[PDB]
Design a protein around this ligand. Structure first.
Ligand SMILES: COc1c(C)cnc(Cn2cnc3c(Cl)nc(N)nc32)c1C
Ligand SMILES: [Mg+2]
Length: 210
């Protein structure tokens, strides 16, 4: 049921740079993932204007932030367009190869990690704070899939059997032991107000019952 794939060499080199560089400004990961969710919501909204049945899988367009201190996870959920199996296995890595190479150029010349988003590879900044990332996703045209990687040069894809989503994407960050500040409600609110105040969809921060 689970298929294992190698990352393309450039992506693998990027993930190793991100994991093993000393860089203290790690909070930018959350800005980049919210920006990704916003773009995904823009895309389904646009598609729905000429085919309203694209929203039959769900009319709400929003972003939820869900910390869980018991599992040490931070989950970002959106109801955007989602990703197909072809996206997860090939398309995303292929479009990213070009920006990755330029980002690794931009860096040695005189750039810092915070500009990662300008090269279209902001997703990989998740590995600043995560030892593992799980992505659950459902596109209109495909089934529900789970993607997972602890970096390491490989990732897995499997059909997901968990609770159905309808449509969209769930990024689950399994946080490193020393990065648990991003589970605190005060800290998340500081980052969102600082970096994402002008996002055009409701962002709901769920509170923990613990
Ligand atoms: C499988 O994990 C990803 C990989 C390997 C590369 N980029 C993105 C960003 N990304 C691309 N499309 C995305 C959509 Cl439709 N939505 C979100 N929220 N992120 C996306 C994701 C989630
Ligand atoms: Mg809600």
């Amino acid at each position: 049921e689970v298929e294992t794939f190698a990352f393309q060499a450039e992506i693998a080199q990027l993930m190793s740079l991100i994991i093993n560089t000393f860089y203290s400004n790690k909070e930018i990961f959350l800005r980049e993932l919210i920006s990704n969710s916003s773009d995904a919501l823009d895309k389904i909204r646009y598609e729905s204007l000429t085919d309203p049945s694209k929203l039959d899988s769900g009319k709400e367009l929003h972003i939820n932030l869900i910390p869980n201190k018991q599992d040490r996870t931070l989950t970002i959920v959106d109801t955007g367009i989602g990703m197909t199996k072809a996206d997860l296995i090939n398309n995303l890595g292929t479009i990213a190869k070009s920006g990755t190479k330029a980002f690794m150029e931009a860096l040695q010349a005189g750039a810092d990690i915070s500009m990662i988003g300008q090269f279209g590879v902001g997703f990989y900044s998740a590995y600043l704070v995560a030892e593992k990332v799980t992505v659950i996703t459902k596109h209109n045209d495909d089934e529900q899939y789970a993607w997972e990687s602890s970096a390491g040069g490989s990732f897995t894809v499997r059909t997901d059997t968990g609770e159905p989503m309808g449509r969209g994407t769930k990024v689950i960050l399994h946080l490193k032991e020393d990065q648990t500040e991003y589970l605190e409600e005060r800290r998340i609110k500081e980052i969102v107000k600082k970096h994402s105040q002008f996002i055009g969809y409701p962002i709901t921060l769920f509170v923990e019952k613990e």
